[PDB]
Amino acid sequence: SGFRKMAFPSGKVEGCMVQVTCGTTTLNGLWLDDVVYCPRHVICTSEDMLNPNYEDLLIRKSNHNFLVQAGNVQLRVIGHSMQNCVLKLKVDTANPKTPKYKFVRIQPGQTFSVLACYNGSPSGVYQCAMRPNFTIKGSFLNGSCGSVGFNIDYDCVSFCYMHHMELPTGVHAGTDLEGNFYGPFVDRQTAQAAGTDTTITVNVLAWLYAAVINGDRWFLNRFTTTLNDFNLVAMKYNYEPLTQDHVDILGPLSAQTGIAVLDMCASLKELLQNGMNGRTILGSALLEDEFTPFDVVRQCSGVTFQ
Amino acid sequence: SGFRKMAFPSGKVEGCMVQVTCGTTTLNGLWLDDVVYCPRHVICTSEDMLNPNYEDLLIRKSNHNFLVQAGNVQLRVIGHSMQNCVLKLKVDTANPKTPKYKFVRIQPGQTFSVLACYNGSPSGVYQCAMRPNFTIKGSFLNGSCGSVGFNIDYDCVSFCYMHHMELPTGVHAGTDLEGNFYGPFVDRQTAQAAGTDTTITVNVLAWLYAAVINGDRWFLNRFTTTLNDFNLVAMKYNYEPLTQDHVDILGPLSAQTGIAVLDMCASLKELLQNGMNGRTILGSALLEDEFTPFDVVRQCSG
Ligand SMILES: O=C(NCCC(F)(F)F)[C@@H]1CN(c2ccc(Cl)c(Cl)c2)CCN1C(=O)c1cc(=O)[nH]c2ccccc12
Numbered sequence: 001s002g003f004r005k006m007a008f009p010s011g012k013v014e015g016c017m018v019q020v021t022c023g024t025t026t027l028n029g030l031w032l033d034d035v036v037y038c039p040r041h042v043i044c045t046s047e048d049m050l051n052p053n054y055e056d057l058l059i060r061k062s063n064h065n066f067l068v069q070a071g072n073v074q075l076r077v078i079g080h081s082m083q084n085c086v087l088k089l090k091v092d093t094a095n096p097k098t099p100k101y102k103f104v105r106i107q108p109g110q111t112f113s114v115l116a117c118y119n120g121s122p123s124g125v126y127q128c129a130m131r132p133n134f135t136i137k138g139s140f141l142n143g144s145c146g147s148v149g150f151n152i153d154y155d156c157v158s159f160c161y162m163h164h165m166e167l168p169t170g171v172h173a174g175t176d177l178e179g180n181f182y183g184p185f186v187d188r189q190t191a192q193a194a195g196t197d198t199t200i201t202v203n204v205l206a207w208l209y210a211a212v213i214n215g216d217r218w219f220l221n222r223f224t225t226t227l228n229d230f231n232l233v234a235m236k237y238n239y240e241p242l243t244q245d246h247v248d249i250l251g252p253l254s255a256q257t258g259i260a261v262l263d264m265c266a267s268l269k270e271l272l273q274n275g276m277n278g279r280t281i282l283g284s285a286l287l288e289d290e291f292t293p294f295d296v297v298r299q300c301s302g303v304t305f306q
Numbered sequence: 307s308g309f310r311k312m313a314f315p316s317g318k319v320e321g322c323m324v325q326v327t328c329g330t331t332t333l334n335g336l337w338l339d340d341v342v343y344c345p346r347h348v349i350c351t352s353e354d355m356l357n358p359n360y361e362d363l364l365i366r367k368s369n370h371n372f373l374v375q376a377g378n379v380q381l382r383v384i385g386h387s388m389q390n391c392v393l394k395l396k397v398d399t400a401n402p403k404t405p406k407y408k409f410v411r412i413q414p415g416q417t418f419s420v421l422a423c424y425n426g427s428p429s430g431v432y433q434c435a436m437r438p439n440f441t442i443k444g445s446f447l448n449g450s451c452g453s454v455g456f457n458i459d460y461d462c463v464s465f466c467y468m469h470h471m472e473l474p475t476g477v478h479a480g481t482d483l484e485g486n487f488y489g490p491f492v493d494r495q496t497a498q499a500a501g502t503d504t505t506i507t508v509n510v511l512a513w514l515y516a517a518v519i520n521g522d523r524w525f526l527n528r529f530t531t532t533l534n535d536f537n538l539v540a541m542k543y544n545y546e547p548l549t550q551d552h553v554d555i556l557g558p559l560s561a562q563t564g565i566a567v568l569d570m571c572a573s574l575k576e577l578l579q580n581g582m583n584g585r586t587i588l589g590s591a592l593l594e595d596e597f598t599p600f601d602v603v604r605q606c607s608g
């Protein structure tokens with residue numbers, strides 16, 4: 001029993017974290033085989049942050065302008081290139097701890113684990129979701145750029161995020177490992193701000209199913225609703241529309257609990273209109289939307305507490 | 307910026323997790339140097355659980371009754387012994403991945419990272435607090451026993467918890483790595499249940515400071531209170547009393563924010579008496595008590 005924000009074990013990623021220094025700027029890099037990946041803004045200087053020309057900045061660099069350190073070991077940079085917003089430093093040594101890995105771009109509403117790192121050294125691991133507005137509500141301080149987000153399936157690490165910057169609201173923005181930003185953000189100094197965000201409806205429903213599996217049933221009701229009438233309520237409360245595919249994805253949780261999806265929707269409708277009246281669900285007094293259906297099935301028992 | 311329930315990187319502990327099988331019972335063990343540590347109830351059978359005599363059960367075992375499995379490599383057990391509620395299986399191979407480590411027992415109100423494991427294979431990592439009633443609100447399924455809790459200081463892993471059982475309310479109980487249970491719980495079948503719990507006051511205050519550091523200020527006010535007047539309110543809402551040592555511990559956070567500890571106590575008193583009026587603090591609609599002052603400083607340096 002129990003339900004926690006649970007990250008993947010981080011050891012496979014810890015063995016890939018290195019420190020990349022260019023000029024007086026130091027941040028984290030990801031060392032996989034003989035390539036080190038890091039944010040390209042490591043080559044920026046305080047003078048040129050307003051509107052940097054990265055092709056110009058890079059052509060003016062040599063291999064010896066990049067210092068890479070893995071633990072106490074210095075890695076010799078033998079090549080450098082840019083792929084969109086990531087720098088790729090070829091080094092003369094393949095990482096012996098390289099796991100099986102993939103570069104995967106995730107969808108808004110999907111979750112991943114973040115390994116927060118500083119000076120090439122991991123400090124903590126936590127679970128994040130990609131917001132509908134393509135920000136993440138991370139926990140990052142100065143020196144954290146180059147930290148990565150990932151999922152692990154079987155023994156394979158699917159890297160999905162590299163951290164680049166913090167927006168004025170305190171949320172965070174970054175790229176996939178191909179250097180393509182999540183959302184309408186750029187690696188320069190502007191009045192960049194997160195767009196309007198919405199609540200991830202399918203995830204809230206998944207979390208209500210987790211609660212039923214864990215014995216919280218107070219919010220259930222006899223009522224039901226149509227998909228269209230629920231979506232009318234969702235729009236009013238800044239929830240994402242629920243699709244038939246989402247209803248299908250919730251199938252296994254529906255089957256394990258014996259609660260039809262549209263019955264759980266009726267329950268969510270009442271929670272939005274009435275609140276919780278001082279009660280809690282899975283130790284929260286608000287509707288949590290950063291657990292996917294997959295996270296719920298992964299963590300919860302296969303049998304319901306009847 | 308930002309504030310998350312953050313666990314320690316788990317790699318150093320993942321390299322220590324093994325699978326222990328005795329009879330038909332399989333659970334997790336912790337492999338450090340040439341010793342494997344696991345819950346002694348691995349030697350129990352379904353019949354002998356109302357009043358197991360672990361001395362009797364263990365004298366009836368030999369080394370070959372224990373199968374230890376490190377990934378795909380079977381470790382040969384060359385000795386077996388019991389230390390309180392943990393079993394110690396001496397194996398013919400020292401773990402080459404043994405980190406620097408200590409066995410430390412934690413206090414109620416302190417936090418640690420849990421590496422949830424199944425069949426010797428880690429599955430997830432999350433942060434936990436030891437409740438005042440010596441339970442932990444973990445997330446554990448069948449096969450999770452022998453999962454460990456730990457903190458990391460520099461390079462050294464301080465193991466503080468090994469998972470033994472789940473209580474009827476869905477909370478969890480276990481031992482330190484010397485095999486001594488946290489709280490009044492036993493590794494046998496009884497009606498045992500979690501005792502009355504309280505809210506960890508010093509941690510709530512630490513989390514309010516984390517909120518202020520991250521820009522949540524709506525709960526602040528110009529009012530103050532005395533330590534004794536606050537503790538009168540704490541007792542009314544089932545909060546632990548606040549000590550001067552607690553006030554001292556909160557000093558750095560008070561200094562960083564410029565908010566006196568007793569001023570934050572006044573804010574907490576109002577939050578306890580009035581609620582949040584539909585507002586939130588660091589993304590929560592309730593007062594969180596599973597972050598220590600250390601956790602807040604480690605994560606809120608800026
Ligand atoms: O300020 C930095 N440190 C030296 C970089 C310099 F100044 F030398 F350039 C970096 C680099 N940085 C950046 C740089 C260039 C460009 Cl073009 C762009 Cl888009 C971004 C973003 C901020 N950074 C963080 O580490 C950071 C990440 C975070 O999530 N939260 C924070 C909260 C507070 C303070 C810092 C951070």
Ligand SMILES: O=C(NCCC(F)(F)F)[C@@H]1CN(c2ccc(Cl)c(Cl)c2)CCN1C(=O)c1cc(=O)[nH]c2ccccc12
Binds near residue numbers: 330347350478
């Ligand atoms: O029930 C079990 N499974 C093997 C049964 C056999 F073979 F041991 F009999 C174990 C062993 N087990 C125990 C055993 C002996 C003794 Cl003396 C004592 Cl005090 C306890 C406790 C429950 N267990 C868990 O793994 C477990 C931990 C958890 O946190 N949540 C759960 C939620 C649901 C289901 C299981 C779990």
